[PDB]
Amino acid sequence: QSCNTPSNRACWTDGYDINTDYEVDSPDTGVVRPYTLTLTEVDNWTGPDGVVKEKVMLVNNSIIGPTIFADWGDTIQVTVINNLETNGTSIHWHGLHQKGTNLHDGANGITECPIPPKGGRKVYRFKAQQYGTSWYHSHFSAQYGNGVVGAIQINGPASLPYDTDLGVFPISDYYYSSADELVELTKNSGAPFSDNVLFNGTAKHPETGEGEYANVTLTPGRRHRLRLINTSVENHFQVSLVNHTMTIIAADMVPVNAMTVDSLFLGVGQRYDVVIEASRTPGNYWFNVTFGGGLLCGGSRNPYPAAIFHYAGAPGGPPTDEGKAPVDHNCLDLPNLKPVVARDVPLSGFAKRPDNTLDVTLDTTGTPLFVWKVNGSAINIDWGRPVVDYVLTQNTSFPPGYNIVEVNGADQWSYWLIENDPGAPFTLPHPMHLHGHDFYVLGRSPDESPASNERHVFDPARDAGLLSGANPVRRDVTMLPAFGWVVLAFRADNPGAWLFHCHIAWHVSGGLGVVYLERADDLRGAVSDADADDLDRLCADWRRYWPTNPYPKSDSGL
Ligand SMILES: *[C@@H]1O[C@H](CO)[C@@H](O[C@@H]2O[C@H](CO)[C@@H](O[C@@H]3O[C@H](CO)[C@@H](O)[C@H](O[C@H]4O[C@H](CO)[C@@H](O)[C@H](O)[C@@H]4O[C@H]4O[C@H](CO)[C@@H](O)[C@H](O)[C@@H]4O[C@H]4O[C@H](CO)[C@@H](O)[C@H](O)[C@@H]4O)[C@@H]3O)[C@H](O)[C@H]2NC(C)=O)[C@H](O)[C@H]1NC(C)=O
Ligand SMILES: *[C@@H]1O[C@H](CO)[C@@H](O[C@@H]2O[C@H](CO)[C@@H](O[C@@H]3O[C@H](CO[C@H]4O[C@H](CO)[C@@H](O)[C@H](O[C@H]5O[C@H](CO)[C@@H](O)[C@H](O)[C@@H]5O)[C@@H]4O)[C@@H](O)[C@H](O)[C@@H]3O)[C@H](O)[C@H]2NC(C)=O)[C@H](O)[C@H]1NC(C)=O
Ligand SMILES: *[C@@H]1O[C@H](CO)[C@@H](O[C@@H]2O[C@H](CO)[C@@H](O[C@@H]3O[C@H](CO)[C@@H](O)[C@H](O)[C@@H]3O)[C@H](O)[C@H]2NC(C)=O)[C@H](O)[C@H]1NC(C)=O
Ligand SMILES: *[C@@H]1O[C@H](CO)[C@@H](O[C@@H]2O[C@H](CO)[C@@H](O[C@@H]3O[C@H](CO)[C@@H](O)[C@H](O)[C@@H]3O)[C@H](O)[C@H]2NC(C)=O)[C@H](O)[C@H]1NC(C)=O
Ligand SMILES: *[C@@H]1O[C@H](CO)[C@@H](O[C@@H]2O[C@H](CO)[C@@H](O)[C@H](O)[C@H]2NC(C)=O)[C@H](O)[C@H]1NC(C)=O
Ligand SMILES: *[C@@H]1O[C@H](CO)[C@@H](O)[C@H](O)[C@H]1NC(C)=O
Ligand SMILES: *[C@@H]1O[C@H](CO)[C@@H](O)[C@H](O)[C@H]1NC(C)=O
Ligand SMILES: [Ca+2]
Ligand SMILES: [Ca+2]
Ligand SMILES: [Cu+2]
Ligand SMILES: [Cu+2]
Ligand SMILES: [Cu+2]
Ligand SMILES: [Cu+2]
Ligand SMILES: [O-]
């Protein structure tokens, strides 16, 4: 029986609460949550701001798919039906650690082959051994930029009481060009501005006024949970609610001790759960997106993207207080979040070495102009020959573009200094994302404006003081600063092939990623006959389909 109430959100059930180590213990509900998702391709689709898009790719006929709802401890089973015309697809459950279920991670070329179009299907099955807000999206090149996105809401305890859960609130850049058109563009030009920003799938057009603002209703006097998600392909957002603060209670899938802020930076793929108290004069208030960092991590052709938060009982119409711009967040996420379930990372004798350093670089000396590399190699996988097929067939002859980084030893700690192109003339902020794990942010280069051109190259002597293992930020996306660095660590507790990549679609398309091959021998030993059978069958189906495809693979595949 549940003990989770508005006044006691910390409690879940007997023996299970906000302090439970959810990486060890989850309720055994015995419950399965089956879902079916169907992808379709639509030409000349009238979008939410009135502009007709040449082509979109939708989950259940929307550019935001159905939300995957579950409770902590449930089993989730998602049948994905690919009714696109030519593209394969693979659906990644972003933020779900897939503990012991690597082959359900949905990373084509890594953990599976793509699902063939015109009716291909597969069933993903995984456990809700975490709770909080996540999202799902295609990993088939930049396909999710066409609309193959949705939210995940796994209910469980929380670090603050609240009366009402308002639900998921995904915010996304929106382009009139297709994802494939934008990959082609960004091979030889920088990232463009978004045409608009959609809040829960809607917005007004900045010139015509067609469309509608998202409209979120607050109950006067009450505390409301809002589940923010940046589902963009490139835009990084600063969000703020006029005349209201937001109290953070979770970052990505990790509950944190409450932190009240006036505005919030959401990198691509980041989530924040916040509590908003409706304690102001009843009215209508803008929920604004703004951009900082010299627009180096996004801008939009809509100068004032916004939603409306409406107090129940107040008048209708638009807010009248335009509010003030928030502080410039410098394309940086919060460095001081504190997980409720605290952990210490050993930091005794850490030093920079070839085997714990990964340099992100941009190579502009060839064709295409923008080639992204990690440790000197642009990632490039073969959709028909996924990493885990090499592991299972005991083939160690990975192509160089697979960017395999071996991580061995059960329960080892794996440390990584990520450097942003030391010495380069121009660098960009990067939202770095690890599959299969939360990582720990041990430190990063001093906060700067990314437009300041102030360089920081990690100096092991000088910069040890910037590193700490005392309950570090723990999450699954964090920012690599322009002209700087970040040190990350994770525990080798999950045998699998795990992508680690920049979540800007143009960058991972263009080569910015590696594959952590974690405990490969253990992975081979743990993969069930059923998982191996399903891998092999889908890969056979994909390989039979691929030569009939009218289009080439245009990029890394990721
Ligand atoms: C963006 O657009 C999307 C799409 O239109 C919007 O999605 C909607 O989001 C709603 C909020 O998540 C969601 O409502 C939920 O729907 C499901 C039905 O499938 C239902 O389970 C939920 O019902 C709960 O919440 C309502 C209040 O809304 C309660 O009246 C109700 O009794 C349920 O309360 C229980 O669950 C809550 C968490 O969901 C708890 O906060 C609550 O305390 C209570 O939990 C206790 O009881 C449980 C059972 O006894 C127990 O397990 C637990 O431990 C506790 O003891 C709710 O109605 C819509 O379904 C969803 N619509 C779609 C189409 O997806 C979204 O809102 C938009 N975003 C914004 C910001 O506007
Ligand atoms: C996302 O969208 C999909 C649709 O694209 C939703 O799934 C559909 O759900 C509706 C109900 O909401 C169903 O509509 C009914 O269909 C009845 C006939 O169903 C049989 O025939 C279908 C056509 O051949 C066939 O697809 C279907 O198979 C499905 O269910 C079987 C039973 O579990 C299973 O063997 C298959 O895996 C397959 O999933 C049946 O054999 C009809 O009599 C009713 O009048 C009504 O129209 C659809 O059948 C569903 N389609 C599919 C493919 O599942 C899905 O719920 C949406 N998801 C969310 C989260 O909203
Ligand atoms: C956002 O959604 C809310 C619903 O949650 C809308 O609020 C509703 O707004 C209408 C007016 O647009 C209110 O009705 C009005 O009431 C007055 C007095 O009773 C009456 O004189 C008017 O003729 C009209 O009927 C309604 O009360 C209100 N509902 C709630 C629960 O507050 C709001 O309009 C939406 N905003 C936008 C921009 O769409
Ligand atoms: C939060 O979002 C809202 C909604 O987009 C922003 O409101 C907009 O603010 C701009 C800037 O002042 C307004 O433009 C001005 O319009 C007037 C009237 O046409 C004109 O005289 C000025 O020269 C200027 O163009 C705009 O009208 C207004 N939009 C709406 C619908 O009211 C708000 O500024 C945002 N706040 C923050 C802090 O970003
Ligand atoms: C996935 O489907 C899209 C949409 O049809 C394909 O996109 C086209 O790709 C060609 C070749 O690069 C371009 O000339 C077109 O401009 C693209 N069209 C649109 C609307 O974007 C894409 O090639 C497909 N990918 C695969 C691997 O099949
Ligand atoms: C970086 O690449 C070199 C080969 O160019 C390789 O020897 C080294 O092991 C790589 N480092 C990592 C961490 O993968
Ligand atoms: C192992 O992989 C390499 C590279 O993809 C391939 O050329 C070779 O044929 C594979 N070996 C076997 C036995 O399949
Ligand atoms: Ca260079
Ligand atoms: Ca078999
Ligand atoms: Cu993701
Ligand atoms: Cu992910
Ligand atoms: Cu990047
Ligand atoms: Cu990914
Ligand atoms: O991802």
Author numbering: 2 to 559
Which statements did the authors publish about this structure?
Laccases (E.C. 1.10.3.2) possess a great biotechnological potential due to their ability to oxidize a wide range of phenolic substrates, spanning from small toxic phenols to large biopolymers such as lignocellulose. Like other multicopper oxidases, laccases operate via catalytic Cu-centers and coupling of the oxidative reaction to reductive cleavage of atmospheric oxygen into water. The overall fold of the three domain laccases consists of three cupredoxin-like domains with the catalytic copper sites located at domain 3 (C) and the trinuclear copper centre located at the interfaces between domain 1 (A) and 3 (C). The catalytic centres comprise three distinct types of copper ions classified by their spectroscopic properties, an electron shuttling Type 1 Cu (T1), and a trinuclear copper cluster (TNC) formed by a mononuclear Type 2 Cu and a binuclear Type 3 Cu site.
With the aim of elucidating the structure and function of asco-laccases, we have undertaken the structure determination of the asco-laccase from the thermophilic fungus Myceliophthora thermophila (MtL), The structure is known of four other asco-laccases (AA1_3): MaL from Melanocarpus albomyces, TaL from Thielavia arenaria, BaL from Botrytis aclada and AnL from Aspergillus niger. MtL crystallizes in space group C2221 with one molecule per asymmetric unit. In the crystal, N-linked glycosylation could be seen at seven out of ten consensus sites (N-x-T/S). Additional difference electron density was interpreted as two Ca2+ ions originating from the crystallization conditions. One of these (CA605) is directly involved in crystal packing mediating contacts between two symmetry related molecules as it coordinates to Asp530 and Asp534 in one molecule and the carbonyl oxygen of Val341 in another molecule. The MtL structure contains three fully occupied copper ions in the TNC-site. The site was modelled as a classical resting state with oxidized Cu ions, a hydroxide ion bridging the T3-coppers and a water/hydroxide ion coordinated to the T2-Cu, as this appeared to be the major component present. In the MtL structure, the T1-pocket is devoid of any ligands, buffer components or cryo reagents. The MtL protomers are related by a twofold crystallographic symmetry axis parallel to b, show significant shape complementarity and a larger buried surface area than the MaL and TaL dimers, but similar to the BaL dimer. The regions forming the dimer interface have low sequence conservation. It is interesting that the interface contains most of the loops that creates the T1-pocket of the MtL structure, which is sealed by the dimer formation, allowing access only via a conserved narrow solvent channel.
